[PDB]
Design an enzyme around this catalytic site. Structure first.
Site, PDB file in Angstrom:
ATOM      1  CG  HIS A 210      -2.175  -1.013   0.873  1.00  0.00           C
ATOM      2  ND1 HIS A 210      -3.185  -0.718  -0.014  1.00  0.00           N
ATOM      3  CD2 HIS A 210      -2.473  -2.238   1.362  1.00  0.00           C
ATOM      4  CE1 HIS A 210      -4.049  -1.727  -0.057  1.00  0.00           C
ATOM      5  NE2 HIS A 210      -3.659  -2.657   0.793  1.00  0.00           N
ATOM      6  CG  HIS A 236      -6.049  -7.051  -1.458  1.00  0.00           C
ATOM      7  ND1 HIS A 236      -5.629  -5.939  -2.151  1.00  0.00           N
ATOM      8  CD2 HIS A 236      -5.869  -6.750  -0.155  1.00  0.00           C
ATOM      9  CE1 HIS A 236      -5.191  -5.018  -1.293  1.00  0.00           C
ATOM     10  NE2 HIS A 236      -5.344  -5.472  -0.067  1.00  0.00           N
ATOM     11  CD  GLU A 348      -7.056   0.509  -3.368  1.00  0.00           C
ATOM     12  OE1 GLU A 348      -6.455   0.503  -4.470  1.00  0.00           O
ATOM     13  OE2 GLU A 348      -6.490   0.322  -2.266  1.00  0.00           O
TER      14      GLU A 348
HETATM   15 CU   LIG Z   1      -4.989  -4.124   1.497  1.00  0.00          CU
HETATM   16 CU   LIG Z   2      -8.432  -4.209   2.566  1.00  0.00          CU
END
Ligand SMILES: [Cu+2]
Ligand SMILES: [Cu+2]
Ligand SMILES: [Cu+2]
Ligand SMILES: [Cu+2]
Lengths: 659, 650
Positions: A210, A236, A348
């Site tokens: 991230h 993910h 996201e």
């Molecule tokens: Cu994540």
């Molecule tokens: Cu997450």
């Protein structure tokens, strides 16, 4: 120059004032750089801490942009990038550090700011700046475990480390053992997955991923990376594939998704962490907690559950429709190529989303809802639970349920794509006739796992503790080294280039039946992907486990699209042995090639920080789509240029040393 | 001798090993007294910490009883006297310290044990021994705030105290302000009562009351204090009377009892405390948490909610029946005299209960149920919330609901007692014609309150922190000094002895009318009770606020009774109307020969029931206070004014 090394000293002891002296150095700070608390006794201080220091770093007094916004966040508060308000603060600070032309002014701005803003925030803002400036490249940033151990370690140890460091002289200090399997007892069957959820390694990988692929700041400040949407999907998606594997190795079923948000959450989680920066602990979540409408006036969160539900309803619609609509009103088509990438940015919510306002901030807002069940209107003046911070989110079991749901949404798109044709995944001429694995002192086609203690120096992170070394002993899953041996025939008359793609899945299901493709395709975990040159006739390819392009070395962690811990490469398996299908495919590299020049770097795995991602094929390529007609199980999905092998994964409950 | 003063050094820095040196002294500990971790480096330690010490205390090596049971409790674990198992551990340790011949061995046993057992437990076990041992009388035990500040202070300060102590030289250190009104925001109306729930003073009073009047199995001599059952009833009953007063001063209604245990608990509470001994924080309770059956195998708790409900059903039955049944099967009658006292021991479950097995451990088990809603089967390896420790229980709002319920059960007995007759509360000859109050620079019959910062040295409690002073600034309610002035006529011809009994309640109701007796009698808070000699004719009695027998001075509670600064309710800025009441009873009847309030060491110096004039229902015809009164009583309208300002301590 020195400057590069002097910034690394800012990471040292984050809560100790900058004038106290870091490592074998100390800063010679102006008096207008001292905080209001300490400025009125500046003379007494600079002198008092000047001693015992080899070097003295000068710092020039410069302008410094307005630091109001950066300073808005309290010093004793928590910092999360999921919370809308924090995003605006960090993105502004990142902008300041990023906007200092010289590496000397960056040092000056930093030294001033450091003792005025939230340590967690400072660390993030600096990390992002250094990683993405040109003068501060190849710079080895200290592990965030070492600077912020409170996010990685049971709070119990802290008063032991304080005792040990105060009582016992350096050199005679015993390593502090870090408790494992400590969040829940055996009444909770979820406690078995501690070695994955609570492993230092995987939590660091998530945090760092991230870092290098943020979803907010500035497209030139690193947001618009090639296929970051697809990356977000795949990375993910592999977390859950690996999690589901580890579940099967602990006599559990596959993780159940968060069907609907109104129904209670069965699995609670008390993380046992104590933030030394906030001086509080992270709240737990009770069994059968229910998601509740948020009204966190301070954090700038005014979101209803129905808002989340509305976003989901719309995203589903788009996926089925087959296209999305941008702010302008135009239609963008979720095609075979860029469809997944788009969807990722939508789900996201990255500023790359073609219409944030319509399709929302679905994944991120979910993290916040789940972390605030205990105090959603701020009446109890409590902070967010563990799911509210990327650094800690993976510790909670609900993470995998929420991320499981999200994956189902992606899947809904993938099942619309046309099956890969026999043609598309055949390599004319190439035939793989077998693959095996060999470990030292172990039968063929057999992997072994066990526990292993390792040591980490948490000294730089222990504020106001007597200086010296402070080693902590982590217990974590480990696998015996192994190597693949692949038999490939050319039968062409010319040197053929190929991509070796290696995945591993369970052989059967939870009920003990040989798995069907439709099921098994989603449980395949990537194990390696590398380029190989094949001579005419026969070729024996050998590849070590430690050469894996999915993994990063031990040394990087302690000292996919980004680095998965090496010791977590192999599932645990069972003592009685766990059956698994090892699969390899050789694809035609000429089609898969991405013409580009790179030597690569990563978080600081080759790297892939260079513009483009080095594979034209979709991520999870052999198995991302549904089977072509007639195919039913792996053993009849196969083309000549693929091979299957029965592997057996054996665990042994013993603690090996690191040597 | 010195020995008495040397034990007090054990209370210094509870988690720092005993060989590190306390105050201006250090202990010369045998090597077999060292811990297994530190034993193998003894040569390096005794020498290393020997320096900078004026005195060196020798310690003789003795036998030392088995310390297995005392050591069963982890060092980094919490300690509560409510948990069945802890009771057996502490009672055993108390027994060891208690059983040591000389104060040379008490010191030796202590020095050894100290670094092997749980600090919280050690502190309790020692405190209990010293307070009730033969050689160790009149010994001034350090305030438990100073030894364990983690139970009294927002965890946020700790990292500031560590910073200040490490960075800044002694003498130039700024006092650390302790946050007030920090557990909840204004969205929670309960947050207004911070100055009472979270006040250091009242939490210390509660902890200490349970020290001197345990119920613990222990030994019958220690537990069997005069009328401790009635004490338990009354003291806790006055907590809620005072709480309900403070509620009215914050625009809230009277505290609602815990009707029934199946319904959710509306008011959650996150206490914001961090145990430095457990190195964890206390868990919070969420809004609308439900009580759940406990199965804490480790703690030795296997209790179902229905068990609690069954105990309550039985206790109610006994109270209505008018008698209880002992283990033997005999019946014991809840009479006017000892009824309340019995019931108290039954309800809290003190070993004095005439049948623990039947009527249960009702009050105590309730504290545990309420503290474990977040983890009742121990699957999450979490400790109890704040209601599980006497030291912290009063911080939670649910405390007052649970203790409110319990009080209603006691009341159910009191309403069965026969009303006090005109005769019974008349003093033939004596007549009180008026009572007033006067504060410096303020109208008559007017009390003032405000905020006030005070300082406390938490230095002894800050383990592994650079030595020096560490002053903390507490903000707490305070009242302007005042004095009562009472006009009493004798008309007898002889010196009359009398008890002056002073209570204060709210004046009017929700509708703005004079409160009725039935209601108001339960809201009267005791303000003073003292003996007075009256000359024939007229007498002007004057009594200062600081002479109160309900209260103890500031000095004690910062270094025991109710904190002095909490004697007067807060009131409102616009003024809060209150009825001040005084009664002069015939001391000859009330006398208990003998050579205060809640805590008296001797037998209790008053034959009358605790609460006296208002514990029972009104006699026929009586309806409100102004017609309940006899000649030897007087009422006065008082007005309580708050001022939101911070005065210094001077
Ligand atoms: Cu994540
Ligand atoms: Cu997450
Ligand atoms: Cu109590
Ligand atoms: Cu109680």
């Amino acid at each position: 120059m020195n400057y590069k090394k002097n910034l690394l000293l800012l990471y040292d002891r984050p809560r100790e004032p900058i004038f106290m002296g870091k490592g074998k150095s100390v800063f010679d700070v102006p008096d207008n750089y001292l905080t209001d608390r300490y400025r009125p006794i500046g003379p007494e201080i600079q002198n008092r801490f000047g001693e015992l220091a080899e070097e003295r770093i000068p710092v020039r007094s410069i302008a410094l942009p307005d630091l109001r916004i950066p300073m808005s966040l309290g010093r004793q508060e928590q910092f999360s990038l999921f919370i809308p308000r924090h995003r605006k603060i960090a993105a502004r600070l990142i902008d300041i550090f990023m906007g200092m032309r010289n590496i000397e002014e960056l040092q000056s701005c930093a030294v001033f700011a450091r003792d005025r803003i939230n340590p967690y925030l400072f660390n993030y803002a600096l990390s992002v700046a250094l990683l993405h400036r040109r003068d501060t490249k190849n710079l080895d940033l200290p592990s965030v475990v070492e600077v912020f151990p409170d996010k990685y370690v049971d709070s119990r140890v802290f008063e032991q480390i304080r005792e040990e460091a105060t009582v016992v002289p350096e050199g005679m200090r015993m390593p502090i053992v870090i408790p494992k399997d400590f969040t829940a007892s055996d009444l909770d069957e979820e406690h078995r997955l501690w070695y994955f959820r609570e492993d230092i390694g995987v939590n660091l990988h998530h945090w760092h991923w991230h870092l290098v692929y943020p979803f907010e700041a500035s497209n030139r400040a690193i947001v618009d990376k090639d296929r970051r949407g697809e990356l977000f999907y795949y990375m993910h998606s592999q977390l859950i594939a690996r999690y589901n594997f580890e579940r099967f190795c602990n006599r559990l079923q596959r993780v159940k998704r968060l069907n609907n948000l109104r129904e209670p959450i069965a699995e609670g989680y008390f993380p046992k962490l104590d933030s030394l920066v906030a001086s509080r602990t992270w709240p737990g979540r009770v069994d059968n907690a229910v998601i509740k409408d948020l009204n966190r006036e301070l954090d700038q969160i005014k979101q209803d559950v129905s808002d989340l539900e509305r976003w989901i309803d719309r995203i589903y619609e788009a996926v089925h429709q087959g296209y999305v609509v941008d702010e302008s009103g135009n239609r963008i088509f979720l095609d075979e190529e860029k469809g997944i990438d788009i969807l990722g940015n939508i789900i996201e919510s990255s500023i790359l989303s073609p219409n944030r306002q319509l399709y929302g901030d679905m994944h991120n807002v979910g993290h916040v809802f789940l972390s605030y069940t205990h105090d959603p209107d701020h009446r109890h003046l409590e902070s967010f639970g563990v799911m509210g911070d990327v650094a800690t989110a993976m510790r909670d079991p609900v993470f995998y349920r929420w991320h499981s749901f999200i994956d189902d949404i992606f899947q809904e798109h993938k099942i619309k794509l046309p099956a890969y044709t026999k043609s598309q995944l055949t390599y004319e001429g190439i035939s793989v006739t077998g693959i095996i694995v060999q470990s030292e002192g172990a039968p063929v086609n057999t992997l072994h796992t066990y526990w292993q203690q390792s040591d980490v120096d948490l000294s730089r992170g222990m504020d106001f503790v007597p200086r010296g070394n402070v080693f902590a002993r982590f217990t974590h899953l480990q696998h015996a080294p192994f190597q693949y041996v692949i038999q490939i025939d050319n039968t062409s008359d010319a040197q053929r280039m190929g991509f070796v793609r290696i995945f591993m899945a369970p052989k059967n299901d939870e009920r003990g039946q040989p798995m069907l493709f439709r099921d098994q395709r989603l449980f395949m975990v990537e194990m390696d992907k590398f380029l190989v040159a094949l001579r005419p006739g026969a070729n024996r390819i050998r590849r070590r486990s430690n050469e894996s392009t999915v993994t990063i070395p031990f040394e990087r962690t302690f000292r996919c699209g980004c680095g998965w811990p090496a010791h977590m490469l192999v599932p645990k398996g069972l003592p009685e042995g766990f059956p698994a299908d090892l699969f390899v495919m050789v694809s035609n590299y000429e089609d898969d090639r991405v013409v580009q020049d790179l030597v690569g770097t990563c978080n600081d795995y080759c790297g892939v920080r260079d513009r483009l991602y080095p594979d034209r094929k979709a991520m999870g390529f052999p198995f991302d789509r549904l089977a072509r007609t007639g195919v039913d199980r792996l053993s009849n999905f196969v083309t000549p240029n693929m091979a299957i092998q029965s592997v057996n994964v054996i665990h042994i409950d013993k603690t090996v040393p690191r040597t």
